Design a protein around this ligand. Sequence first.
Ligand code: COA
Lengths: 1021, 92
Amino acid sequence: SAKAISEQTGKELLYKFICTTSAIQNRFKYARVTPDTDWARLLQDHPWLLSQNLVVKPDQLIKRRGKLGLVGVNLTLDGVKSWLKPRLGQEATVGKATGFLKNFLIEPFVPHSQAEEFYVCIYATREGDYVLFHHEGGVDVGDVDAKAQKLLVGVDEKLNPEDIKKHLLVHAPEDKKEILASFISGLFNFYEDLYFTYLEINPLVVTKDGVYVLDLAAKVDATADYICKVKWGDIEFPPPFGREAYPEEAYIADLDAKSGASLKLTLLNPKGRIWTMVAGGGASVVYSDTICDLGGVNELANYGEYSGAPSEQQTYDYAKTILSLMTREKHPDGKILIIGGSIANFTNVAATFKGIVRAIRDYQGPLKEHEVTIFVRRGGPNYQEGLRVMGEVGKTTGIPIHVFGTETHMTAIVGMALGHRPIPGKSTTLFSRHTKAIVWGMQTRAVQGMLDFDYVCSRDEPSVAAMVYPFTGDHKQKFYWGHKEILIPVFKNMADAMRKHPEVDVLINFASLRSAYDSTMETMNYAQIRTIAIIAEGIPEALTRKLIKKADQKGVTIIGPATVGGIKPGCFKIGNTGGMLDNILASKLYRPGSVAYVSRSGGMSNELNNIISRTTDGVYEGVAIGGDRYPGSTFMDHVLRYQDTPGVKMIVVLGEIGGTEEYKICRGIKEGRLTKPIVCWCIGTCATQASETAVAKNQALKEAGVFVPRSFDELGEIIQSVYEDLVANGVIVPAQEVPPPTVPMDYSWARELGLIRKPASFMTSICDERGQELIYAGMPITEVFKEEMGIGGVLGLLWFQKRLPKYSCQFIEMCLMVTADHGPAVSGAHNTIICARAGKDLVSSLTSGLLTIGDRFGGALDAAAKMFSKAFDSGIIPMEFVNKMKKEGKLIMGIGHRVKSINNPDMRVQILKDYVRQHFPATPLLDYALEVEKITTSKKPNLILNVDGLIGVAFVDMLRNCGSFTREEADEYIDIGALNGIFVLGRSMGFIGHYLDQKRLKQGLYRHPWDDISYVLPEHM
Amino acid sequence: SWARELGLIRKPASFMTSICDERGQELIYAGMPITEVFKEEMGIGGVLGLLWFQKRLPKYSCQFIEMCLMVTADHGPAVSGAHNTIICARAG
Ligand SMILES: CC(C)(COP(=O)(O)OP(=O)(O)OC[C@H]1O[C@@H](n2cnc3c(N)ncnc32)[C@H](O)[C@@H]1OP(=O)(O)O)[C@@H](O)C(=O)NCCC(=O)NCCS
């Protein structure tokens, strides 16, 4: 899409990026005045208004400003102020469009003669670039394309200055011929390496002083933004001059601008009764065409669309806006809502219809105030159930909703909404049954659709031989052939894919817009690839022109960019064309017919498949050439391809407004090149160049011998009429329909629409990862960091699924801080160091040390809590518990230190103990353990509470003594093993620290000397 | 299970496993049943040839694999992994 630029921005980059020796004068000398400014700031920051005289212009892309009286010529500064006083911010009409004027540009006026103002322009065409010069300047040139000097510089060639000094300036004064030529050459260096499309200087004010631009007109290719973001910068694309945008149009523009889908809405008149909400671009163009040709010219309220599969919230907002905009006032004949569309490819109809019923059932009252009637037509994946949903919403809410499927014509519902009808060398055989493909990209859904198409077409071998994905190694992907599973090799380089597969004669290029050019250029130097399909939407037009010229040099057939692909029923299908198998089997695309078709956009090829299925014996072949401006194959490269093939008996072409391509089809009829019956229609008349309108194309096609209907509603009728007349002389022999080999459907599709039930494993009452936020136990991660809970809080959430109080989380953190490292001598730290010195990695070292936390090392946490809990809940005093554990062996776990005894406390038992005494209500098991401590410190001086015993008993007090745990949760967490987890998670910090320490000291492999071992082996076994 | 027993739903499978079919009436190794494993008189080197390489190795190569497993057995308790196993076993 090459669209216009503001002229301030045009001369901005023109002064910024020209490269020629001719002096462009008045550089960086422009001003912009708005109704949203005062004058003094740009008065003092632009001192050069204080020196020269001025010329002012409206900066809103206004066509022909001279004869309409909008330019102020040769006026001084305060004179410009009094000239701009009744003009800046007031209404004006140009052409047939009105509006306010909010932008004006001031430029230093130059005194000159009208005899040496000149005209130059460079515009883009398909076969190259046209550079046109004319010596008669000014706006009074008139007819420019018959008298001016034109030169077409080809694609992939550089301008010679000798050709422009020979051919272009032939009617120019020679005193200025050596200057401007270099300037024009420099401007071509501005035209090409800034990715322009259309650029006029009219007039080019060149004097003896130098060169000057006064007026510019440029359409630039925005899709090359990824090439020019470092060179354009903050570039704005203005709208055309028309009426002021409504705030709801601005809201739909904002919702399109934040989202990835395509949302469009433009009102024709706000008090119309025919409101349309169509899914599809060419579909909505055809619906608005059929409305404006069936008498609904005046009260067609809007045209807009929702496509690219929008979300539920996005289509709810779109349907909310379009339902509110027809609520404001009432119309005595009643209002009509047309929710139409063509056959969708992969979109579930029920999701978008769930958005629509969320808008409708919330707006049921105000919609049945204004006497509305809703007509719905749909098709695609799961359309019948969505039609049933919106019909039952119409039946409960009382609003009349007439749902329709693929058995109706597409635009019949606006014929019966308005009451006009009742309410009920290049090859010629591209694809074959032995065609093998190579797919560029990770597109397993498209490859699986191609294999499913091959299975339902009774084919022997898959269409896809390999895939090419450069971001991973050579492996195999698992795909389905009916019921059986096959493997398709995924290669990394394309040369590896071509060496293993010499029978591949088509490549499907699913690359992005910025990497399809390099992939296609690297593809075209392989001689086995005879045809390429480019899928990407938005390849800039110079790059696809280079692709066209190398394809024409090499002789390969590019199915053009921005296409869905092409489908030849019975043999081959490109990627995702057709859609799911519901659309392939519903439109009978598994057996060959005798009708070919060519479309431009892809969204209408589904409806053409449906029309040729329901009126004719079927499609033989069908190719969408693409929505780009310069497709890799036009209409003619495929109509010559169909005219030479003997299998097809009639051709159908659906064109678009714009471009004189169908007149070549007329010319091919009048010379006798095309003999087979042609049925054309150029969609989108809607006139509410003059040879590029669809009514002129339809008129010149209807006169040349092409069966052209009166509207789109009669297209299936005229195809059926030509078909029955072409059977009537006996050249089409319809074969009797064989049933296709059926497939099992899918698991994901049958569970997405919810008709299969599977029992699940892994019940996980922890950490919902699905959704928009990571939820912990029941609390989102933003609430985790907002409620200011630390690592003790998230251990409370992950381990216990409970929001612990703020002292218990800090106690958990304190326990993780004291159960960290305890030196390298101990058993697990030793194993981690022996592992780290063997050079392993962090996980194996930590893991080899962690797998010693058992009963003897690290198991006093859980045992010293089970023992004291089984003693305290049995109901014996401590002086009997010590003697009970004295008559059985088995020392009290959690009692005793080897050094820190009494009058010498352990000082990490003490920090914990004064935490549990202060911030911690009702601690009976710690009091019991301290009474056992009082009894045992009388026996020995070094029998104190361990840290491994005090954390155990204080953690049982933490569980059963605060809130949140009853007593069977609190004992289950003490039985399952949530106290081993405290030691393991604490000691993992020390073990990772030991690993990093032995990696930082760079120690070698450990060997453990033989005089510490004392081998005690048997004599001779 | 009922829709896949009568075969009207299709699910792509993971875990492609070119080794050890446990389903059926016999345990099949690489391609060879367990009764053929013990009937052809292949030892532990034969079943390493079947499980690891999916190939029926010749009778000297299986015996060489067994010989390598016999010499790459223990090399005393001083070495690093034997040390870690003993520190782990003494921690009970
Ligand atoms: C299908 C389609 C969207 C292709 O998808 P795509 O955008 O190419 O998806 P990809 O995964 O290939 O693109 C990923 C991009 O992000 C980049 N990327 C991906 N992962 C990345 C990572 N981890 N780090 C950095 N960059 C990464 C890649 O570089 C790639 O862009 P580049 O290769 O051009 O640089 C497009 O071809 C299409 O729309 N086709 C159909 C056209 C249509 O609908 N028209 C029919 C009617 S006209």
